[PDB]
Design a binder for these strands. Structure first.
Lengths: 1016, 621
DNA sequence: AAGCAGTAGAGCATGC
DNA sequence: CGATATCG
DNA sequence: GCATGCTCTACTGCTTCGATATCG
């Protein structure tokens, strides 16, 4: 591109120096307002590969402009802004760097103005900090650059202030990034820092220059990194740098510039352990000036002092653990000062927090003190923490951001104590549950500290005594009801799954830094999760037609706030329990499966039950557990064949769950009775093609059947599994289709030949016949000159299928609308050519599109069905065959497999017919009518006395939907009513051994209940 | 129980309002104990504990948890058991009623923020038990007299009368007219035995006495008047609440509640309005609950008179050519420029809010509106918020009562317009742009007297030394005045046109900052557009002036040159032939967005340019 | 020494 | 006088 | 509860223009 870059390359080449530098400063500063402020990898990558050229570019720009003395503007601006660019880019500069090293060394060697000298060294210190020891030293030797800048310090003097600071800073960083071979040059470097320290602050005259002190001590600290002076070599320079820390920490007040306190503090915060004996004498003044500088009204000196103080207190506590003889008075001062802290005089927010941590840390070495001071603690401490939180209702003042450290002090005192005062355990176990609730309003590198604290207190309150370990179960049982009660920031459940993952068994990166447990936690968790499902009582009930299905319009629950409380639970098991089932889950399967089956059998129609069962059997496949303890084997092989016939009359997700349970047995050892499993695998592919995972797991089980079942009862059972898999070939559909073709290939050669040549004539050929042998419905598209006829029938078996299933809502509604106008048209011609061979294939898809799912397509086609019934059931067109075809279509729409919504709609339809039949006709010529109600009842009787297991359920459902009628009629409500009672009772008796699951008996009992009140 | 609770209250509380840091656990322990005390109070109507809470309510001026006490007063204000509620009411009333050496802050704040919530929030409209026990319990102290020898009893007399006024006011705040009119226990309470007259007896003398109040002048009183003002305005609130608790069936406020006759040194408004401190006015401004519970088992709007005044005029609109009660009377009291500042300044901020009934009668109250709004009477730099309120209300009903018709109103519009363009800058840019919008609205509604001050706009943009944008106000105001109409015929009343347009092209030559010369090019080109729309003026002079300035650009200025040419050509087509060969020349090497800009330039004139195609082809079209 | 040249600077103010 | 560093 | 931005100022420094010891 190089638009403004070409502008810069054309304004550089002219005269009027400092003017081309003005343009260079202004143009790199205008790159400043272009380069970074677009959150983009693409166009920023374009800018990187635009700016990283070495033919043109800013590096060869200073090759045109290093030998130009008054060009201080580039020598400031370009390595100020490209320093920011070097900060913003990642690690992709590592071969882009030797040119920067050569450029910056050249610019530093020929800088002119100290008011423009700093950013070329900012780029230096930024690359040398952001990129450490690596093979970049094998790219360009910084050990060469160490000798270079060793030159530019040793043969260098009277650099005034700022680069005088920066040479010591870069020098210490040269001592910091990989000093592994510097032996005798690094000998006197500490003396080189101490020489500047002596000429700055060993004489009261020549007032000490401020930031070069901090630069020298930063360099001394950074050389001390990886060259650690443990107090065994020379106890004199450690003494003198301790004196220099002391001079760095004096409370200089009447000024704002405060760099060297932060410098001495950050020196103290790393090499604390190498100190041995110089940490003893002036400890009280160190304590006082540090605790004063915790309230030093600043932004980061606060954090520096806090880190320094807590690190020093940790070090002196680990000292006095092994120094448990000399420091009795020292810890005595600590105890009384800390009691004066822990008493509320007016302790505002943090002077108590900075001593609670230290006090619990002192509780470790507080073993041989009193055996009662420790018990005055931990009631003082629990009483002290109990007041702050667990407040009123709704205001705030959170403070649990630092309550992890208080939990740490609680645990560290409670480890060494004996014989707990134990009145405050219902406060401790009301504390941990509130903390576990208050996880998701945290931030990373505090969520993990919070988990560290909670596992620390669970390590504490389990090794004490079995009289005490009940609390560790009560808290997790309460916390499960806490985190499984939320409305399904405000979380839902998705911040504790990682908590339980790296808490339960994979907490083995928690036991390292904090001075069996997984068994106790898993056992308590499975105890609680079987406990909760007891006290739910999810028994749904009836709210205000004759519904006939299991999960029907009986929908309102006794506890409508418990359905959510369980559906939050089931996924919470499913995302937790497969985490290392390798040694835990194996004994639990019998009892868990037994309790789940007992709860499942009284209430079968609740999903998620089978999902939990599916989790258990997937773990029962992951571990072996099957060879036929034999009781569980017998239990499952009962229960599977129970549910396999129980799963008939459902619709969607109870179907999805029962099929994903049924197709997931171990089944290398359930080899018997594959015929009672294959009517599930003939449906786990048929209910695909609008849904992936059931249509995935079916193939995932057909994988195991073929290689683990001996291929002999399999071999006749391949004309039913394979031939429905052909609807496929026309982790998403493509990966699974490639999986399908690999299975279909390596299944063998001779077996897969069934897949294509099975039937070829069930309904494909019936669609491939004409609906009338002679064409009708001439339609003459109206033009101005032609009016040509087009026979409006040939396209119909594509319209009437696409309007059924499209997954295309933009014109499914359009196909329904034009089909509405088409039925109106075929009424429009036949009102003045017979089509009773056409109605028979028109209607039993028309009612299915009248009442399928959606509401606008049910707003149409329902008054259409009503109005066509009103026209049909009449006198001017009485007893033509179309009435008979409509009546017969109604009746075999009544008696049919699984289509429960259509069954109930046709029950409503026969109620409509029964009302309008008696409404319309006069009995003068109605004596030879086939539309007569006697004929409908006689058809119903022949339906009733019938061994077809749905043929009489049709009649009993019809009577359920007509006993509202003929409580107002006469001359029919009297005579054959007990005859029909006899008929219904004989069919009821014939239904003795069908099944209770089919629901005929509970329908005919309501039919005979309708009978007895109307006779009595 | 009261003794031991009082002993612990004085044992472990602070005395002041905060006396603490808000967030120390000492403060948290204090709010803990106060929350528990309200927890005890919130469901047991205890006339001991209500007094024990109200004594620690008014310790100091304003605590932190004040709204908690208002919510608990709304809670206890309806709880059932209506006899206990009036027991609490009479308890706190009698602890107010008696005498003890106290501080009168407390004697006021009791009857302000203790029981006015309880009477305001719904007890019952049948709970007239206090309305039976108060008539000869406060009318007698109402008819008292001023012991103006010792102040220490005189101010308590004032405070007790003020408390009685506010109790009568809040009592009359919610009551029908029939249970004041007919013979119930107000007339039958103040009388011994039932009488025969229609019950309109005590109402009339009560209206009379509270009207003698707020009319007694301080012409011989210069001793204690700050409480006397509150006395008087609360008496007026009593009068308006009793006249609104009766259905004020007649035209009545001409002889009542208004119209003081100052021949006997009378007053109404200067009594209740402050009249000493003018408003100094910062110008601009389910079984899981069960299983958890078993685990649980182990500025003038804030000026003390404004709101009921707004309420009474709102009632006068919502229920009922000149009216002598408040139309003609307040018209005389505002239209006279001899009344002080505060009466008219307050009288603005009621007709501003209730202007809806003044919609067919705004023409009378529009002339003194501009009279007060234009000239210096307000303070600061014209009472910004009220200034934009007044003129925004006026120009809201544009199409009625134009500022023309009255010549003083025309020159008032002129001088106010001059003032608001004079002090306009305000270096926070948002309200500066809002000010320019304000000026745009004013110049688009003025339309008749222009009075556009030249040498003023010329004084604004004529500043040299292009290092600061002090001419930016001139060019934005130029865009405002030339945005619609009004050509600058300068040498008629101002100064000559020649150095006028020369100074404008000089400000174009101020190539220092961005928007100054950008808008200079823009409005200068729109001036060119109008003076080519009317070529009767010698336009070609300023044409060659801007052409000369462009030629002095194009030598060493190129980035500024192409963009000012771009602005003046987007304004104006036919001045491109002078440099068409120049932009055709340096079409390349302007890589960046200026390439797009000069393409937009060469878009201009193609209906007349011959053989452009060779030019474009040799210049990389 | 002498005008400017620059950011640390607490103070306030924002937000999740 | 010729350098030679330092202040201010 | 820490992590983060707008303030416009006061100290501190750089540059820069004058003085001025110091040994032969």
């Amino acid at each position: 591109v190089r638009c403004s870059l070409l502008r810069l390359q054309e304004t550089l080449s002219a005269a009027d120096r400092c003017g081309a530098a003005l343009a260079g400063h202004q143009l790199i500063r205008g790159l400043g307002q272009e380069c970074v402020l677009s959150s983009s990898p693409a166009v920023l990558a374009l800018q990187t590969s635009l700016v990283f050229s070495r033919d043109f570019g800013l590096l060869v720009f200073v090759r045109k402009s290093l030998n130009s003395i008054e060009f201080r503007e580039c020598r400031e601006e370009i390595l100020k802004f490209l320093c920011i660019f070097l900060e913003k880019m990642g690690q992709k500069i590592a071969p882009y760097s030797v040119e920067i090293k050569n450029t910056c060394t050249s610019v530093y060697t020929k800088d002119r103005a100290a008011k423009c000298k700093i950013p070329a060294l900012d780029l230096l210190i930024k690359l040398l900090q952001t990129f450490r020891s690596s093979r970049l030293m094998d790219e360009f030797k910084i050990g060469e650059l160490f000798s270079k800048f060793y030159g530019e310090l040793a043969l260098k003097k009277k650099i005034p202030d700022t680069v005088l600071e920066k040479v010591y800073e870069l020098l210490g960083l040269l001592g910091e990034v990989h000093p592994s071979e510097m032996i005798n040059n690094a000998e006197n470097l500490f003396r080189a820092f101490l020489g500047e320290l002596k000429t700055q602050m060993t004489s009261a005259v020549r007032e000490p220059k401020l930031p070069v002190l901090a630069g020298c001590l930063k360099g001394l600290s950074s050389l001390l990194c990886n060259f650690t002076k443990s107090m065994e070599e020379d106890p004199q320079t450690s003494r003198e740098i301790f004196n220099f820390v002391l001079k760095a920490i004096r409370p200089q007040i009447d000024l704002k510039r405060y760099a060297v306190p932060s410098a001495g503090l950050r020196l103290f915060a790393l090499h604390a352990s190498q100190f041995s004996t110089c940490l003893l004498d002036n400890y009280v003044s160190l304590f006082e000036v540090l605790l004063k500088w915790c309230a030093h009204t600043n932004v980061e000196l606060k954090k520096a002092a806090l880190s320094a103080l807590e690190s020093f207190l940790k070090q002196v506590s680990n000292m006095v653990a092994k120094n448990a003889e000399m420091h009795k008075n020292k810890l005595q001062y600590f105890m009384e000062q800390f009691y004066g802290i822990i008493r509320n005089v007016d302790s505002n927010n943090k002077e108590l927090s900075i001593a609670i941590r230290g006090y619990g840390l002192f509780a470790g070495p507080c073993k041989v003190i009193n055996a009662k001071d420790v018990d005055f603690m931990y009631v003082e401490l629990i009483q002290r923490c109990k007041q702050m939180f667990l407040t009123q209702t709704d205001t705030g003042d959170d403070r649990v951001y630092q309550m992890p450290s208080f939990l740490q002090s609680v645990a560290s005192v409670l480890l060494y104590l004996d014989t707990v005062p134990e009145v405050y355990t219902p406060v401790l176990e009301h504390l941990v549950v509130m903390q576990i609730d208050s996880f998701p309003q945290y931030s990373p590198k505090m969520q993990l500290v919070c988990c560290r604290a909670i596992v620390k207190v669970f390590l504490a309150l389990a090794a004490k005594g079995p009289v005490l370990r009940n609390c560790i179960s009560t808290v997790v049982h309460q916390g499960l009801i806490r985190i499984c009660s939320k409305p399904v920031k405000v979380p839902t459940y998705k911040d504790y799954v990682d908590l339980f993952r790296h808490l339960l068994s994979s907490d083995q990166m928690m036991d390292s830094i904090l001075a069996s447990l997984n068994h106790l936690l898993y056992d308590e968790f499975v105890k609680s999760v079987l406990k909760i499902v007891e006290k739910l009582d999810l028994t749904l009930e009836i709210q205000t037609m004759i519904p006939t299905s299991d999960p029907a319009a009986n929908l309102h629950p006794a506890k409508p706030k418990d359905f959510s409380a369980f559906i939050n639970l089931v996924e919470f098991c499913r995302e937790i329990l497969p985490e290392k089932q390798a040694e835990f889950f194996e004994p639990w399967v019998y009892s868990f499966s037994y309790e789940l089956i007992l709860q499942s059998t009284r209430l079968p129609l609740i999903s998620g039950f089978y999902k939990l069962l599916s989790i258990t059997v997937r773990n029962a496949k992951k571990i072996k557990y099957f060879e036929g303890k034999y009781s569980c084997f017998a239990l499952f092989v009962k229960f599977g064949k129970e549910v396999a016939v129980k799963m008939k009359q459902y619709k969607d997700e109870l179907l999805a769950s029962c099929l994903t349970f049924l197709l997931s047995l171990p089944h290398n050892i359930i080899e018997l009775d594959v015929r009672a499993y294959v009517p599930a695998l003939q449906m786990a592919f048929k209910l695909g093609l609008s849904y992936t995972p059931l249509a995935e797991v079916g193939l995932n089980a057909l994988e195991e059947w073929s290689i683990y079942i001996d291929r002999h009862v399999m071999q006749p059972y391949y004309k039913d599994i394979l031939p429905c898999l052909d609807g496929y070939l026309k982790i998403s559909l493509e990966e699974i289709r490639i999986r399908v073709v690999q299975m279909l290939g390596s299944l063998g050669g001779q077996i897969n030949k069934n897949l294509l040549t099975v039937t070829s004539s069930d309904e494909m050929m019936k669609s491939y016949v004409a609906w009338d042998r002679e064409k009708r419905l001439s339609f003459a598209v109206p033009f101005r000159e032609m009016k040509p006829v087009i026979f409006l029938d040939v396209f119909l078996p594509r319209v009437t299928e696409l309007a059924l299933t499209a997954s295309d809502r933009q014109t499914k509604v359009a196909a329904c609308e034009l089909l509405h106008s088409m039925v109106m048209f075929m009424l429009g011609k036949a009102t003045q050519p017979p089509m009773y061979q056409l109605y028979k294939r028109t209607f039993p898809v028309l009612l299915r599109l009248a009442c399928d799912v959606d509401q606008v397509t049910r707003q149409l086609y329902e008054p259409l069905v009503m109005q066509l019934i009103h026209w049909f059931t009449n006198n001017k067109k009485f007893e033509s065959q179309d009435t008979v075809a409509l009546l017969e279509a109604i009746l075999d729409g009544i008696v049919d497999p699984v289509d429960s919504t259509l069954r109930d709609f046709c029950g409503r339809c026969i109620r409509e017919f029964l009302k309008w039949s008696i409404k319309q006709i006069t009995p003068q010529q109605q004596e030879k009518s086939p539309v007569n109600t006697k004929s409908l009842f006689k058809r119903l009787y022949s339906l009733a006395l019938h061994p077809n297991a749905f043929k009489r359920l049709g009649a009993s459902l019809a009577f359920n939907n007509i006993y509202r009628e003929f409580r107002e009629e006469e001359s029919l409500v009297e005579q054959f009513v007990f005859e029909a009672l006899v008929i219904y009772m004989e069919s009821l008796a014939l239904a003795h051994a069908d099944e209770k699951s089919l629901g005929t008996i509970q329908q005919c009992c309501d039919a005979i209940d309708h009978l007895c009140r109307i006779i009595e | 129980l009261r003794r031991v609770l009082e002993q612990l209250i004085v044992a472990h509380f602070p005395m002041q309002s905060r006396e603490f840091p808000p967030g120390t656990p000492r403060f948290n322990n204090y709010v803990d104990c106060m929350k528990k005390f309200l927890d005890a109070l919130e469901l047991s109507q205890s006339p001991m504990l209500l007094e024990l809470m109200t004594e620690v309510l008014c310790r100091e001026q304003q605590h932190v948890m004040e709204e908690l006490f208002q919510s608990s007063f709304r809670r206890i204000a309806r709880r059932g058991s209506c006899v206990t509620q009036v027991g609490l009411l009479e308890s706190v009333y009698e602890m107010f009623r008696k005498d003890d050496p106290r501080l009168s802050f407390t004697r006021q704040s009791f009857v302000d923020r203790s029981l006015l919530t309880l009477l305001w929030h719904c007890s019952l409209d049948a709970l007239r038990e206090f309305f039976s026990t108060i008539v000869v319990d406060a009318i007698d102290v109402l008819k008292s007299r001023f012991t103006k020898l010792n102040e220490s009893t005189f101010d308590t007399q004032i405070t007790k009368k003020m408390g009685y006024y506010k109790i009568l006011d809040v009592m009359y705040s919610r009551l029908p007219k029939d249970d004041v009119h007919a013979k119930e226990s107000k007339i039958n309470q103040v009388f011994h035995g039932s009488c025969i007259t229609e019950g309109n007896e005590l109402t009339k003398t009560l209206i009379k006495l509270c009207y003698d109040a707020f009319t007694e002048n301080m012409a011989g009183e210069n001793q204690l008047l700050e409480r006397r003002r509150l006395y008087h305005c609360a008496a007026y609130n009593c009068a308006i609440s009793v006249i609104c608790c009766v259905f004020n069936e007649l035209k009545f406020y001409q002889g009542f509640l208004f119209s003081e006759k100052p021949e006997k040194n009378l007053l109404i408004f200067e009594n209740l309005i402050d009249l000493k401190r003018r408003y100094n006015f910062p110008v601009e401004v389910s079984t899981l609950s069960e299983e958890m519970s078993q685990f649980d088992f182990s500025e003038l709007n804030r000026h003390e008179c404004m709101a009921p005044l707004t309420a009474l005029v709102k009632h006068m609109h919502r229920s009922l050519r000149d009216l002598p009660s408040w139309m003609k009377f307040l018209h005389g009291k505002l239209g006279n420029p001899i009344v002080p500042l505060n009466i008219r300044l307050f009288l603005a901020k009621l007709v501003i809010n209730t202007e809806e009934v003044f919609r067919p009668y705004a023409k009378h109250w529009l002339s003194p509106l501009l009279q007060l709004a234009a000239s210096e009477n307000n303070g600061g730099e014209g009472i910004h918020y009220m200034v934009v309120e007044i003129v925004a209300t006026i120009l809201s009903w544009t199409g009625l009562a134009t500022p023309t018709g009255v010549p003083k109103d025309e020159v008032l519009a002129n001088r106010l317009l001059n003032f608001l363009m004079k002090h306009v800058f305000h270096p926070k840019r948002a309200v500066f742009r809002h000010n320019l919008e304000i000026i745009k609205t004013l110049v688009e509604c003025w339309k008749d007297c222009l009075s556009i001050p030249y040498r003023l706009i010329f004084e604004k943009f004529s500043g040299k030394d292009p290092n600061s944008k002090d001419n930016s106000v001139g060019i934005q105001l130029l865009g405002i005045v030339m945005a619609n109409d009004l050509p600058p015929y300068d040498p008629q009343c101002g100064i000559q046109s020649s150095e006028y347009f020369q100074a404008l092209v000089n400000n174009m030559s101020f190539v220092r900052y961005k928007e100054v010369y950008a808008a200079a090019a823009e409005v200068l080109g729109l001036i060119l557009r109008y003076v080519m729309e009317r070529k009767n003026i010698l336009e070609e002079s300023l044409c060659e002036l801007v052409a000369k300035q462009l030629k002095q650009h194009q030598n060493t200025m190129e980035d500024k040159f192409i963009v000012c040419l771009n602005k003046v050509t987007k304004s104006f087509p036919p001045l491109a032939d002078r440099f068409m060969n120049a932009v055709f020349f340096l079409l390349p090497k302007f890589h960046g967005v200026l390439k797009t800009l000069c393409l937009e330039v060469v878009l201009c004139r193609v209906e007349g340019m011959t053989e452009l195609y060779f030019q474009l082809k040799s210049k990389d079209f």
